[PDB]
């Protein structure tokens with residue numbers, strides 16, 4: 001039942017007993033493994049036409065309350081039995097319930113802790129939870145968002161944070177942030193099927209224009225936010241330029257690199273995922289930490305369907321782009337990642353390279369083994385996009401499963 | 415839409431459905447509660463030895479299934495030849511408890527097992543495989559002759575050719591034919607006084623077994639090991655491969671002149687010899703197969719893995735890189751030059767090799783072919799994506815479905 005897990009570099013063995021707490025199903029079955037799929041309908045939390053029946057919600061709620069009081073060690077006290085009483089009374093009457101701020105804070109950190117695809121989980125206990133459940137309009141969402149950004153950025157000394165908007169109610173639409181991240185660069189479809197800017201943001205850029213935005217035409221034009229209040233059309237809000245910290249990219253030894261005009265924002269904040277805590281679903285709960293250099297240098301700038309600067313940089317380096325055996329792609333990629341680390345360090349902006357990051361994740365796997373008897377990790381996401389075997393996580397076997405609280409994917413509001 | 419797995423390629427935006435997984439008859443390690451897909455040796459990819467022949471019904475359903483696959487491949491499903499062969503197989507199993515494959519059936523199944531291998535990125539070559547029938551072999555001495563012929567044919571002086579030699583199958587009430595070494599060519603790993611290892615740390619146990627069986631050891635980082643071949647019910651016999659038979663490549667760098675001075679090298683022929691070949695229920699415990707290397711296997715895994723040659727720091731020091739801080743990306747830089755050196759050395763020596771970019775681009779082409787041909791292709795993402803420059807190759811952005819299909823190459827316990 002309990003999977004035997006091995007590290008092939010050290011030859012050490014551990015038994016994951018935590019996977020037994022998993023109550024939510026993954027995309028896999030004995031017939032076939034679907035662990036490499038990014039978006040399975042299993043990790044997704046779609047709509048619904050009728051509220052979740054009390055039986056199920058009550059069991060998820062009681063479990064979470066059990067998790068919480070067990071964290072503060074008062075597992076069994078009167079406060080515990082009374083909090084359970086309260087949840088049950090509210091669900092029985094209203095078919096739903098509400099969390100306390102302390103409970104919401106414990107649940108958010110635990111959602112991050114439980115996130116299989118996150119390599120930065122060693123920082124899980126250090127999270128600023130902004131309570132925004134007392135928000136009634138898109139305009140208010142914007143103010144809250146601006147406070148999250150100014151706090152998290154911190155003049156370059158980034159701090160992990162999350163802002164939790166009102167949960168979903170059966171009798172209405174959701175509070176949603178249409179953008180996938182608080183900071184994104186525009187992607188303009190240019191006549192000849194070409195794309196100016198970030199190809200990943202083409203659709204969102206169009207929606208912003210459809211909703212009245214005056215677009216530019218640069219490669220790094222920060223998009224405005226489309227915030228949506230329940231059952232209302234999204235409203236456009238332009239982020240103040242002073243709130244959006246950006247780092248211009250230059251290379252430590254290649255003077256011509258800076259001339260490329262490359263740059264990237266400091267704050268990585270996902271805003272399209274759903275935070276589930278004790279049966280309660282929060283459709284708008286943006287979270288942010290700090291970047292791992294590979295996200296910018298490798299993926300964002302080198303992916304074929306993104307900025308794809310690999311060839312341009314190779315040419316500037318005068319590499320042999322004729323054949324692949326010259327490893328021109330590899331060499332160029334290394335220098336770009338190097339330029340990213342040098343630039344963020346020069347500008348005094350928090351950044352972590354993939355070696356430091358994965359080394360800290362291995363320590364985290366160790367902490368969780370003693371703490372909980374295991375740790376859910378998605379190998380393909382934990383192992384960096386370049387130099388995979390040069391890092392310790394590559395030689396570590398991992399078990400993947402769903403634990404709750406959890407950050408899950410959800411449908412696009414449009 | 416369709417009831418089968420929906421698979422997406424994020425680079426192109428294309429979608430495909432895997433219907434081939436519906437033909438899987440062997441369970442994997444995963445369940446809806448958790449994914450155990452990253453485990454190298456899960457007990458689900460291994461086939462434990464047998465102290466008793468396979469139950470005549472499980473073996474029959476498996477045998478029947480294989481014969482149907484064979485007849486469908488030649489387009490004679492339902493024919494008289496098909497029905498007669500099925501009757502002939504259950505007639506054999508009926509009185510002997512087992513059965514035997516026809517020459518062409520063995521050639522078909524061997525090519526099919528490679529075709530069905532989820533961890534192999536070189537499957538676009540699956541149709542081109544030299545199948546050496548060695549089911550008449552009766553001694554460890556003959557096993558050596560057969561292997562020497564395999565090595566000579568496959569090596570072909572640098573212009574490598576994929577090949578497999580099939581020795582007699584598992585027979586109940588009789589010992590197995592086994593090659594003790596993991597690969598036909600392996601470098602020795604000597605356990606030092608100080609706990610360290612000289613040579614290949616992966617080969618420490620086999621090196622000690624060879625010594626225990628009469629081999630006089632050397633003291634170099636690149637000493638080719640002798641073969642420990644075992645015929646049924648006999649102790650394993652030691653055989654030394656003639657040096658002229660083992661083609662090796664001295665490593666040098668195209669621009670870094672000092673690299674040649676490192677004394678690094680690697681053999682040309684990659685030949686797995688400890689895997690079991692399973693065809694229609696029949697088990698071939700000794701069936702060594704070979705192809706040609708992908709540059710990353712040597713330059714990245716073999717030479718740079720912490721538990722292998724671990725030369726990353728040495729080369730970085732030669733390149734005068736800051737090995738005190740991670741952010742200098744000294745590991746990434748050194749690893750790149752080490753892979754370039756492997757590619758340069760093999761191309762120079764006129765020995766066959768393929769870089770990770772070309773290999774993965776050809777595997778994508780294989781995926782398209784298999785989509786039209788069988789409606790899918792079982793692929794283990796972690797093993798398909800190269801150990802360096804992952805998202806720089808096309809396969810990284812391709813979602814894959816993994817499952818077990820037979821014929822297959824499976825893991826087996828060590829004979830010792």
Ligand code: HEM
Pocket residue numbers: 112115117118119120121123127160161162270287288289290291292295352357381407
């Ligand atoms: C502290 C710094 C952090 C670093 C260095 C870090 C790094 C990463 C990386 C490299 C990924 C993969 C991204 C991709 O490939 O698209 C990731 C994913 C993720 N991170 Fe972290 N993380 C950090 C903080 C956080 C925080 C603050 C939260 C939540 C409160 C969080 C939640 C997640 C989740 C849920 C995912 C999965 C996202 C998805 O599936 O798209 N991370 N993180």
Ligand code: HEM
Pocket residue numbers: 524528531533534535536537539543576577578703704705706707708711768773797823
């Ligand atoms: C022709 C060139 C070929 C190339 C470039 C190729 C490449 C590879 C690579 C890179 C691996 C991963 C090895 C590792 O990470 O340890 C692999 C695994 C494998 N290949 Fe191929 N292969 C080729 C030929 C063959 C042949 C001829 C067969 C069999 C007839 C075959 C069967 C397999 C199997 C079963 C594995 C998985 C081994 C395991 O699970 O440990 N391959 N191949």
Ligand SMILES: NC(=[NH2+])NCCC[C@H](N)C(=O)O
Pocket residue numbers: 036037038380381382424795810811812813814
């Ligand atoms: N963002 C990531 N780290 N993705 C890892 C690989 C996931 C997926 N198999 C793909 O096509 O990319």
Ligand SMILES: [Zn+2]
Pocket residue numbers: 028029032033034035444448449450451
């Ligand atoms: Zn799986």
